[PDB]
Design a protein around this motif. Structure first.
Motif, PDB file in Angstrom:
ATOM      1  N   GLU A   1      41.764  38.123  33.678  1.00 41.94           N
ATOM      2  CA  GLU A   1      40.832  37.105  34.148  1.00 41.94           C
ATOM      3  C   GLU A   1      39.809  37.785  35.048  1.00 41.94           C
ATOM      4  O   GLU A   1      38.556  37.616  34.902  1.00 41.94           O
ATOM      5  N   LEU A   2      40.354  38.468  36.063  1.00 36.38           N
ATOM      6  CA  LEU A   2      39.482  39.144  37.036  1.00 36.38           C
ATOM      7  C   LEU A   2      38.600  40.193  36.358  1.00 36.38           C
ATOM      8  O   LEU A   2      37.566  40.537  36.906  1.00 36.38           O
TER       9      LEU A   2
ATOM     10  N   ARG B   1      47.200  26.743  30.187  1.00 38.80           N
ATOM     11  CA  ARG B   1      46.474  27.915  30.640  1.00 38.80           C
ATOM     12  C   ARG B   1      47.183  28.560  31.834  1.00 38.80           C
ATOM     13  O   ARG B   1      47.315  29.777  31.878  1.00 38.80           O
ATOM     14  N   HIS B   2      47.618  27.707  32.758  1.00 39.95           N
ATOM     15  CA  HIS B   2      48.245  28.134  33.990  1.00 39.95           C
ATOM     16  C   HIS B   2      49.406  29.078  33.792  1.00 39.95           C
ATOM     17  O   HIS B   2      49.514  30.036  34.521  1.00 39.95           O
ATOM     18  N   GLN B   3      50.204  28.850  32.757  1.00 40.43           N
ATOM     19  CA  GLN B   3      51.467  29.555  32.567  1.00 40.43           C
ATOM     20  C   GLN B   3      51.309  31.057  32.388  1.00 40.43           C
ATOM     21  O   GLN B   3      52.099  31.833  32.929  1.00 40.43           O
TER      22      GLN B   3
ATOM     23  N   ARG C   1      26.826  40.320  32.599  1.00 42.30           N
ATOM     24  CA  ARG C   1      26.036  39.706  31.533  1.00 42.30           C
ATOM     25  C   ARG C   1      24.891  38.873  32.150  1.00 42.30           C
ATOM     26  O   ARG C   1      23.776  38.906  31.705  1.00 42.30           O
ATOM     27  N   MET C   2      25.227  38.115  33.178  1.00 38.98           N
ATOM     28  CA  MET C   2      24.246  37.284  33.850  1.00 38.98           C
ATOM     29  C   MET C   2      23.162  38.104  34.500  1.00 38.98           C
ATOM     30  O   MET C   2      22.026  37.689  34.517  1.00 38.98           O
ATOM     31  N   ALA C   3      23.550  39.235  35.081  1.00 39.12           N
ATOM     32  CA  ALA C   3      22.636  40.156  35.741  1.00 39.12           C
ATOM     33  C   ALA C   3      21.579  40.629  34.772  1.00 39.12           C
ATOM     34  O   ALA C   3      20.414  40.737  35.146  1.00 39.12           O
TER      35      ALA C   3
ATOM     36  N   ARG D   1      35.628  37.774  34.741  1.00 36.66           N
ATOM     37  CA  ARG D   1      34.590  37.274  35.664  1.00 36.66           C
ATOM     38  C   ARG D   1      33.550  38.351  35.905  1.00 36.66           C
ATOM     39  O   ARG D   1      32.346  38.064  35.887  1.00 36.66           O
TER      40      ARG D   1
ATOM     41  N   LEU E   1      45.652  31.309  40.302  1.00 32.39           N
ATOM     42  CA  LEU E   1      46.150  29.988  39.930  1.00 32.39           C
ATOM     43  C   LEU E   1      47.382  29.584  40.765  1.00 32.39           C
ATOM     44  O   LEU E   1      48.141  30.462  41.180  1.00 32.39           O
TER      45      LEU E   1
ATOM     46  N   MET F   1      25.507  34.682  42.280  1.00 30.28           N
ATOM     47  CA  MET F   1      25.656  35.975  41.644  1.00 30.28           C
ATOM     48  C   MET F   1      24.330  36.626  41.362  1.00 30.28           C
ATOM     49  O   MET F   1      24.078  37.713  41.851  1.00 30.28           O
TER      50      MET F   1
ATOM     51  N   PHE G   1      49.896  22.088  41.288  1.00 29.60           N
ATOM     52  CA  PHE G   1      49.531  21.533  40.005  1.00 29.60           C
ATOM     53  C   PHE G   1      50.704  20.741  39.422  1.00 29.60           C
ATOM     54  O   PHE G   1      50.490  19.658  38.865  1.00 29.60           O
TER      55      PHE G   1
ATOM     56  N   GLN H   1      47.108  18.499  29.811  1.00 29.15           N
ATOM     57  CA  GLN H   1      48.119  19.306  29.130  1.00 29.15           C
ATOM     58  C   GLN H   1      47.554  20.704  28.841  1.00 29.15           C
ATOM     59  O   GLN H   1      48.217  21.732  29.088  1.00 29.15           O
TER      60      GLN H   1
ATOM     61  N   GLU I   1      45.039  22.178  30.261  1.00 28.59           N
ATOM     62  CA  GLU I   1      44.794  22.879  31.529  1.00 28.59           C
ATOM     63  C   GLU I   1      46.091  23.528  32.008  1.00 28.59           C
ATOM     64  O   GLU I   1      46.088  24.684  32.427  1.00 28.59           O
ATOM     65  N   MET I   2      47.176  22.764  31.917  1.00 27.39           N
ATOM     66  CA  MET I   2      48.496  23.217  32.347  1.00 27.39           C
ATOM     67  C   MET I   2      48.904  24.431  31.546  1.00 27.39           C
ATOM     68  O   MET I   2      49.457  25.367  32.118  1.00 27.39           O
TER      69      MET I   2
ATOM     70  N   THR J   1      46.671  37.919  35.773  1.00 30.65           N
ATOM     71  CA  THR J   1      45.468  37.851  36.569  1.00 30.65           C
ATOM     72  C   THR J   1      44.445  38.908  36.135  1.00 30.65           C
ATOM     73  O   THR J   1      43.263  38.617  36.097  1.00 30.65           O
TER      74      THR J   1
ATOM     75  N   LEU K   1      50.756  26.853  40.809  1.00 29.77           N
ATOM     76  CA  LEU K   1      51.578  26.149  39.837  1.00 29.77           C
ATOM     77  C   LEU K   1      52.251  24.957  40.508  1.00 29.77           C
ATOM     78  O   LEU K   1      52.318  23.860  39.955  1.00 29.77           O
TER      79      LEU K   1
ATOM     80  N   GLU L   1      31.292  38.729  32.976  1.00 29.37           N
ATOM     81  CA  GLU L   1      30.386  37.578  32.926  1.00 29.37           C
ATOM     82  C   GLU L   1      29.222  37.795  33.891  1.00 29.37           C
ATOM     83  O   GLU L   1      28.059  37.555  33.543  1.00 29.37           O
ATOM     84  N   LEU L   2      29.560  38.258  35.090  1.00 27.85           N
ATOM     85  CA  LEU L   2      28.546  38.476  36.120  1.00 27.85           C
ATOM     86  C   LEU L   2      27.568  39.554  35.661  1.00 27.85           C
ATOM     87  O   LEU L   2      26.362  39.396  35.846  1.00 27.85           O
TER      88      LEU L   2
END
Lengths: 79, 126, 279, 93, 129
Positions: A44-45, A35-37, A54-56, A48, C12, D58, C17, A30, A32-33, A41, C14, A51-52
């Motif tokens: 999110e993009l 989040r999808h809605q 930060r990792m570097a 990432r 994603l 990465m 899913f 539920q 997970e679903m 994008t 839908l 995050e990369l």
């Protein structure tokens, strides 16, 4: 190949697992679903990429010592 | 086989044993090898060893089980090979041999076989 | 958006899913069965030998042979041996043949005699040498027999433009029975190398790529018009992974060129190797 | 490193990150955030960072002089703790 | 002048008058002129050739006597000039006194790599502690 019988007491546990497992899985799916809605994008993009980066950066803080044999396991507490 | 001794670890397989025992003998002929327990135990104390090979089915096994605990302090790889009789031959000896320590000479001819096999052995020590 | 990053995979879906979820009827394809009393137990070279075993073998091997020859001379199957003679032994062999009588005729016999023995040494050599090369052809005929595990390597570089580098990589690959491939981007665009074989082969090749060959070195290339300088100093090589694989689907070592970064993947794609490329 | 997602079953199955040389000891996902990053340790002395979407490598970090038996990562993901044949315990930022 | 100043500084600056008219020589007089006035001159002189590592290394010591600052000089220095192990040895021997230091040793070891003097640094300062 055989089916082995025995251990009713353990049998009890499997029930517990099922009750616990089934609910948890349902909740998880539920979530997970949900989040999808949103999609959107772009956020999110960005994330990432951040995050990369930060990792570097990451580096040592200190070393430390323990013993004279190599260290086979380390674990962090939930806190 | 027989039940391979549970304390035997790392245990080399068939394909690694051929590669190891071959290096042993190849060193025997340059007299970079040392055979037997005490001869091997001497090496570590001095600090010249490369790696130790031991016999897995050494009867009883407890007589060599001290080597592992010494090797871990001097940071020296080690493995067991499945029979002593085979290890006896590779050292150039009629008779059974339970341990052997290849040594160091960094001008040596065989230097590149050795680094090869230690690289393989250290993998087994997970 | 975007591409080398392969973000394209983040985005994603839908219908998959929702369609999955509806089919599942709530909670995955696991517990569909639920909406189990018993628990189940489910089933499944060379010897060496020492110094003293060489002697004994060498002597007991030699003894049988010489004594067998000895009887052959007794039984009269074989020529009685004549003396060996040399320019040392020459003077004191009074075998009935023209010793003092013909002095230079006995020089020739011994001097000729000496060379004939040597010629034999030379002959045994060349005949043995030649035989092996025929024997070698049986080796040529022998056909691989698959190894169970395939060691592999992977390398990655800025430029391959120098031909002398392009050529070595074709030779050694064919020389050592390395399976694999190579690719790159257009001409000047960077690329990747893949190689697979028995672990001894790879180590040679690895040594070549890194320590022997100089990728930073400068070369004067030939074009359709003429010759021009090239400075590759910036070009460099480094290894990515070495490891182990269930099967090597590479049939032969096939150098090629790709214009894009994509068909480059589809190239590897054929081999299920898409992943071996690293941006 | 193989990564198998059970849902696909018919045709999705395993995506192989080619990670490390010389073995792999302990792979760790990032706990919070549902899992996105992978962190793994082999005897190569390096330590790796992976996306869970592309599984593109990465970044890598080298502070160990020897091999690495095992590693665990901070729940927030502001720590990385790695431990090592070399007998230290090295805190990564 | 080195033999002369070995047994008067009034001549030193006098000799340094014609010396600037012409990191070998500069460091010499800088090392000699050490008897915070240098921090000015050293900075002006070390900004000329920016060798740079010795320039970095020398000023740090004067800062060490003056100063925080010392660590700052070291950190900037090491990254720019990573190669000499003399620097990272000193930096780690700073942090150590106030454990972080091993990381500083070890973070730089691999950037070199596999020259000698870094392993001894680690050893030599693994005993002390």
């Amino acid at each position: 190949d055989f089916f082995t019988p025995a251990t009713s007491e353990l049998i009890f546990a499997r029930r517990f697992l099922i009750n616990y497992s089934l609910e948890r899985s349902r909740k998880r799916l539920q979530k997970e679903m949900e989040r999808h809605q949103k999609f959107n994008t772009r956020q999110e993009l960005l994330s990432r990429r951040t995050e990369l980066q930060r990792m570097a950066n990451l580096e040592l803080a200190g070393s430390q010592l323990v013993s004279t044999k190599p260290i086979s396991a380390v674990s962090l507490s939930t806190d | 086989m027989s039940a391979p001794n549970p304390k035997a670890f790392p245990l080399a397989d068939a394909a690694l044993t051929q590669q190891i025992l071959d290096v042993v003998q190849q060193a025997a002929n340059l007299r970079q090898l040392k055979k037997g327990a005490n001869e091997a135990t001497k090496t570590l104390n001095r600090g010249i060893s490369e790696f130790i090979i031991m016999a897995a089915d050494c009867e009883p096994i407890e007589i060599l089980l001290h080597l592992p605990l010494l090797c871990e302090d001097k940071n020296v790889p080690y493995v067991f090979v499945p029979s002593r009789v085979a290890l006896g031959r590779a050292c150039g000896v009629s008779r059974p041999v339970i341990a052997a320590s290849i040594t160091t000479n960094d001008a040596s001819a065989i230097k590149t076989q050795i680094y090869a096999v230690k690289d393989k052995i250290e993998t087994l020590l997970i | 958006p975007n591409l080398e990053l392969h973000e394209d995979k983040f985005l994603l879906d839908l219908s998959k899913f929702k369609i999955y979820y509806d089919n599942n009827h709530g909670y995955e394809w696991w517990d569909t069965a639920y909406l189990v009393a018993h628990p189940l137990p489910e089933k499944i070279i060379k010897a060496y030998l020492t110094q003293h075993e060489r002697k004994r073998l060498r002597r007991n091997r030699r003894k049988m042979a010489r004594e067998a020859r000895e009887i052959k001379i007794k039984l009269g199957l074989l020529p009685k041996p004549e003396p060996k003679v040399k320019l040392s032994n020459m003077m004191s062999v009074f075998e009935n043949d023209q010793n003092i009588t013909d002095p230079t005729a006995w020089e020739k016999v011994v001097k000729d005699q000496v060379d004939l023995r040597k010629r034999k040494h030379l002959e045994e050599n060349e005949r043995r040498h030649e035989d092996a090369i025929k024997r070698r052809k049986e080796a040529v005929n022998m056909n691989v027999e698959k190894p169970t595990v395939y060691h592999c390597k992977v390398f990655q570089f800025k430029n391959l433009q120098n031909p002398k580098i392009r050529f070595k990589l074709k030779m050694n690959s064919k020389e050592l029975s390395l399976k694999g491939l190579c690719l790159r981007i257009r001409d000047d665009g960077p690329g990747i190398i893949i190689v697979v074989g028995n672990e001894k082969s790879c180590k040679f090749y690895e040594n070549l790529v890194m320590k022997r060959i100089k990728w930073n070195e400068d070369f004067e290339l030939h074009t359709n018009t003429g010759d021009i300088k090239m400075d590759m100093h910036n070009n460099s090589i480094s290894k990515t992974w070495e490891g182990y694989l269930q099967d090597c689907k590479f049939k032969g070592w096939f150098m090629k060129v790709c214009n894009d970064q994509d068909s480059l993947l589809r190239t590897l794609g054929q081999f299920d190797s898409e992943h071996f490329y690293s941006p | 490193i193989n990564v198998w997602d059970i849902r696909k079953r018919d045709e999705g199955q395993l995506n192989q990150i080619l990670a490390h040389r010389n073995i792999v000891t302990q792979v760790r996902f990032s706990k919070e955030d549902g899992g996105k990053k992978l962190v793994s340790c082999g005897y190569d002395n390096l330590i790796n960072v992976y996306s869970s979407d592309t599984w593109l490598k990465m970044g890598s970090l080298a502070g160990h002089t020897d091999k690495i038996i095992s590693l665990d990562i901070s729940n927030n993901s502001h720590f990385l703790v790695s431990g090592g044949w070399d007998r230290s315990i090295k805190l990564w930022n | 002048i080195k033999l002369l100043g070995r047994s008067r500084d009034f001549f030193q600056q006098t000799f340094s008058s014609l010396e600037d008219f012409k990191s070998g020589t500069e460091r010499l007089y800088y090392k000699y002129v050490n008897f915070n006035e240098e921090a000015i001159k050293f900075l002006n002189e070390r900004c000329l050739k920016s060798i740079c590592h010795k320039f970095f290394l020398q000023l740090g010591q004067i800062y060490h006597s003056m100063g925080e600052m010392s660590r700052e000089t070291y950190l900037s220095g090491t990254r720019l000039v990573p190669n000499c192990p003399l620097l990272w040895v000193s930096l780690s021997k700073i942090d150590e006194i106030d454990v972080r230091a091993r990381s500083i040793l070890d973070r730089g070891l691999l950037k070199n790599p596999d020259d000698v003097l870094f392993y001894i640094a680690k050893i030599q300062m693994e005993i002390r502690l």
